[PDB]
């Protein structure tokens, strides 16, 4: 029949501000129609790497919920948003499971997220005692203890603040320019699947 | 937990915060250089002070991690680089005195203006005009006046300052567990902890003497030929048996002999390889010059320039309203930002300079993957050598014919090769005894081998013995003749040019053997060879992570600097000079036979 009530992809992709990678935004997408051909046929995306599913059959299959995680990382750190990777982002900021079904979409955002003075509103976690579990968010701002001595809440010697700012500038290299990353996670649960593709007439 | 993990986390924090502070400082320096305005000077000074204070605070924090409990070579290298006190070990009064002395020497050298007695209404500064007088005049007493007047004013101002400078730098170096300031400078080539590839500070002087002893026959023949030609130019001043007069070498100090090419040309009647007119006829813009250089670097397999390079570099003079430094400089600003600041003209020299600076940029791009404090050359010689090899390759007639700048029917006979090799010898071979003598004199001054009352008596004795250059009139100890040069007056190491010159031809032989060139070494071009680019990039990607001996093994297969590639490069010229010196006397006498 006639289809309306599209899924809110405008409020994820075209958001005025994105979250930091340590505090990545997760939006649960339910009970709407998800048109994936609009995203795939866009020329504005640099990375559209899908793991576990192909883009052609996205517009046909149906899923119970869609998780849209949005954050900003560097150009050289886009490769770490993948199953089985190692790095600062994978270990300490955003960890993907090995058995991940979904798509990683990234695009350059030097135009919006970089200012001439330096945009320090994007943070990343530099130190954590252990690696993150998949789909875990750590927003703690407690001082990292690298040494035997207690930090006592003050950043001195062997005790560092774990969140460090990115300093985006428009004159940076392509490996240091800000990239907005949206990761879509597709899961099927025993509940009735409601995020279905558009049906042709 | 462990000391090594603590040092690794500290190095991660240092790398991340240092890279951003270094970017801000470098961008301020760039904004000053492309726009000379007082607010840009203030911003540069503020950024530099923040950067220096941050380095002091991080070095102070870094020393608290002992070196002997760390086993990873890269972590130990970064900690060794960071834990150097520098001037911080010295007292605050003496540190302030040393900084004041360095600044006032910089002002005296930069703003030194000297003109002829009895005509003082206007005067000429060295950089604007004395260079042209030294490089183009053919008058004996005029060059003598310029040379003696500049060494009189500059040396008489700088002699007490240099006497304070040597004592303060020796005090800082012995406070830093070095024998002298010369040992501190030689510590750049020090490799410790690697089995077989260890290099000592004391081995550098021995290697320099061993290489120079093999340099000496070629320089003696070149000196005899230059002496005969200068005798033709100036009939009575130059003796057949003696040294060359100091003020006749084509430059202010004798650093290069490249301004004597007109006087000492073998075959003037034969044409030159000047390609300036060909670019003028085809309307080659500076953008086209850099695109051709980029085409050269992509032909060998190296990465091409970034979009930010083309957008952010200044490759043309901005105009009258905006002031900029004219000196060509490649800037590695950090964070993948690479720029070239050159006031490019349509000349061969600017085209070769474009190749040289883009070689600097390629070297900077290659070690971008390395940690911040290891983003340098393995030694001070490699960074200049990798630009000089591109300057060597681009200047070849094969490269000019390949890119269309030279006519395909240009006749490459032996005479043009001889005069081109002589020009390259005047630029390259002639600087080697001056560089070696200057560094050996500074090392003996820092070591205390030469007392302060005997500095000049030894110095001229060294110059006659090594360089074969005699003083026009004797100088007493009120003069300070070495410090009239830019590098010595402003606290710069000078052995980098000697090491650069040997590394240049070693790299050239390695890449030409890789590229399967079948002729003379000076006729070799490294374009179109992927394997040569791969052999270069293996060393280029390392940066300062590996010892310079291991990097040299990676390129040439040798663990030490070698002199045989340079001698192989100039072998046609060496045979020609031996043929031309049959009647004349090779070698010089240290006596006062020409003039004193
Ligand atoms: C986001 O912005 C682009 C650029 O204006 C636009 O073409 C696109 O339709 C917008 N929405 C989505 C869902 O991509
Ligand atoms: C150079 O500085 C002047 C001084 O204010 C400024 O007006 C001009 O915009 C600067 N040039 C550039 C290219 O920004
Ligand atoms: C040294 O540390 C670096 C990380 O900075 C690591 O990648 C490298 O493998 C280490 N080397 C050794 C021999 O452990
Ligand atoms: C730097 O100076 C301090 C102050 O004396 C000293 O304890 C330290 O050992 C010095 N560092 C090195 C590497 O010598
Ligand atoms: C550099 O080379 C790559 C791959 O050949 C190419 O995609 C890119 O456009 C080149 N860069 C420029 C500025 O031409
Ligand atoms: C160049 O080659 C010719 C032919 O053998 C020879 O006569 C001449 O002397 C050579 N000139 C030089 C400078 O080697
Ligand atoms: C190197 O390759 C380019 C591209 O094909 C070619 O134009 C050039 O002539 C080659 N160089 C030589 C020396 O043949």
Author numbering:
A (entry chain B): 330 to 530
B (entry chain E): 19 to 614
Sentences from the paper on this structure:
SARS-CoV-2 utilizes a trimeric spike glycoprotein for attachment to the host cell receptor angiotensin-converting enzyme 2 (ACE2) and for the subsequent cell entry step which involves the fusion of host cell and viral membranes. Given its crucial role in the viral replicative cycle, the spike protein represents an important therapeutic target and is a critical antigen in host immune responses. All emerging variants contain defining mutations within their spike proteins, with multiple mutations clustering within the receptor-binding domain (RBD) impacting both ACE2 binding and antibody neutralization escape, while mutations within the highly antigenic loops in the N-terminal domain (NTD) across these variants reduce antibody neutralization. Given the rapidly changing mutational and antigenic landscape of the SARS-CoV-2 spike protein, a structural understanding of spike protein mutational effects and the discovery of broadly neutralizing epitopes is of importance.
